[PDB]
Amino acid sequence: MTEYKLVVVGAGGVGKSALTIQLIQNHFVDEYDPTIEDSYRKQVVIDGETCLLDILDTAGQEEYSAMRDQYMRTGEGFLCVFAINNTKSFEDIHQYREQIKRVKDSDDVPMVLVGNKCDLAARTVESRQAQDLARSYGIPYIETSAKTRQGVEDAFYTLVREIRQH
């Protein structure tokens, strides 16, 4: 069976939780955890052996840090969400990919720069400049929008595909 932890991170307001719960319960949630810090679990068979997928999401309440540090050292998959409408998510990926290298103390994670919220808000982040951002780190690039379940499949699936082959 084996199990994997989807260490998700990427700005606050990109749609990272509504995206996770979507693949699980399947339902566009406007806010199913505006301040909750619980781990989501959903087991399925991704053409393997029923690999349990324990997704991990953040919240933002308080600001002392503690489990986040031990989350980069425990989990391994990095779904770096980034909304392509506000742009602050892109600048947030340029720093969240340094602390992960801090914890593991290495530059070779199964990172995954996924752009969410591409179903609206004029494309502020085209796929060209974004293609050169992830291409430099050797990480896969994808698009996503839980508002219509578009791209959500290529994100989660490609995530377990990078951790497995690794």
Residues that bind Mg ion (CB under 5 A): 16-17
Residue 9 tokens, joined: 């991170």
Residue 54 · residue 41 · CB < 8 Å: yes
Site for ligand GDP in 81-110 (CB under 6 A): none
For residues 162 and 110, the answer to whether their CB atoms sit within 8 Å is yes
131: left (phi over 0), alpha (psi -120 to 50) or beta: alpha
Residue with smallest beta-carbon separation from Mg ion: 17
18 is in an annotated binding site: yes
Residue 31 interacting entry, from Mg ion, ligand GDP, none, C-beta within 5 to 8 Å by type = ligand GDP
Stretch that binds ligand GDP, among 12-20, 65-73, 98-106, 156-164 (CB under 6 A): 12-20
Q: Which residues does 128 contact at the CB level (< 8 Å), separation at least 6?
A: none
Residues forming contacts to ligand GDP in the complex (CB under 6 A) are 12-18, 29-31, 34, 116-117, 119-120, 145-147
